[PDB]
Structures are given as C-alpha cells and as structure tokens.
Amino acid sequence: KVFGRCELAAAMKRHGLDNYRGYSLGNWVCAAKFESNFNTQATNRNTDGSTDYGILQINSRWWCNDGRTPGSRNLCNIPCSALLSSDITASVNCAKKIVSDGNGMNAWVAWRNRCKGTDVQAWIRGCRL
Ligand code: NA
C-alpha cells in the first residue's frame, strides 16, 4: 500500500508517534517519506546479508526475522514479512523500540540525511490531524 502524506500522518498520530521520545510527527512522516516513499511494501537488500523492510525500512539483522540474515537477532519478535503489511501497527511498535535504542532517530539514515535539522513541520502541512 502507498500511503498519502496526511493519511500516514494521521495513522502515525493514532499510534502515538507524535512527540514520541521528543520527536514531532513531522520527523516521522519525513523519515517514512525518504526511507520508503510511503510504500509499505518497500524492501532494500543490503550488502551484509540483511534487508530493510517496510515503510520505516527496519533491518533484519537485529529487529525482525526473515530467516536469511546471518547472526540475526529478532528484537521486535516478528517476522520481517509482518513489516510489509498495509497496516502500520507492527512497524510503529518496532520503531518505538528502535528510537529508544540509544541513538534516537539517527537509527534511520534517510532521516539523518534528509530530515534532521530541517523544518519538519512542512511534512504535516494541510493535514487534518
Ligand atoms: Na533477525
């Protein structure tokens, strides 16, 4: 499923991401935009054997089990395929653990490269939240 900017913002707000860990909703929408382009089925195979899955591109080496990543942990206790659903619940709950893992939102490279320090409020414009 390809989420609409405000449609996603609303969904994320429902799931408690707005100001979660001090990170405004705009930060989360911006991260999703640059990580997966709002596409829940987004997958990116890395060179180390791991793969990034879904709307927030969660990595299979430590957060979900895809059965093909060497020395992989399943910290979120879910199959990586669950992070590919149109429903964002699994991704949000797992992201909540990732952002609290000692690096804040820096865990998401696209967020750090295209959202960090910018006017993230723009990502929530026109939205009826
Ligand atoms: Na894993």
Side-chain angles (χ1 to χ4, degrees):
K1 178 188 176 178
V2 177
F3 270 90
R5 187 159 56 69
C6 291
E7 178 186 21
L8 181 62
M12 289 179 153
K13 182 188 179 64
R14 285 175 225 142
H15 288 93
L17 285 184
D18 184 31
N19 292 328
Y20 187 80
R21 236 74 205 321
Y23 292 99
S24 63
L25 189 59
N27 274 297
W28 297 103
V29 175
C30 186
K33 173 68 182 181
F34 299 119
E35 288 292 351
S36 69
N37 202 26
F38 303 149
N39 184 0
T40 64
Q41 297 194 339
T43 59
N44 179 77
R45 310 268 254 292
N46 293 308
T47 54
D48 57 6
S50 70
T51 301
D52 295 328
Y53 293 90
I55 197 141
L56 282 173
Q57 293 288 279
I58 294 172
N59 194 260
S60 64
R61 179 145 264 130
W62 295 282
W63 307 107
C64 61
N65 173 230
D66 68 359
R68 68 166 85 174
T69 310
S72 71
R73 298 308 310 266
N74 186 183
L75 292 178
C76 286
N77 196 19
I78 66 315
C80 299
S81 63
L83 300 170
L84 297 178
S85 59
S86 297
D87 166 14
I88 66 169
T89 300
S91 290
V92 175
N93 294 336
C94 187
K96 286 182 175 180
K97 292 192 183 305
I98 298 173
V99 75
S100 305
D101 207 38
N103 301 287
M105 289 197 75
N106 291 296
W108 288 277
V109 196
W111 172 85
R112 180 266 179 178
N113 291 338
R114 294 214 256 187
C115 307
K116 192 176 182 183
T118 71
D119 180 20
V120 295
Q121 137 259 283
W123 292 102
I124 279 21
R125 69 153 170 265
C127 302
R128 302 178 282 275
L129 303 164

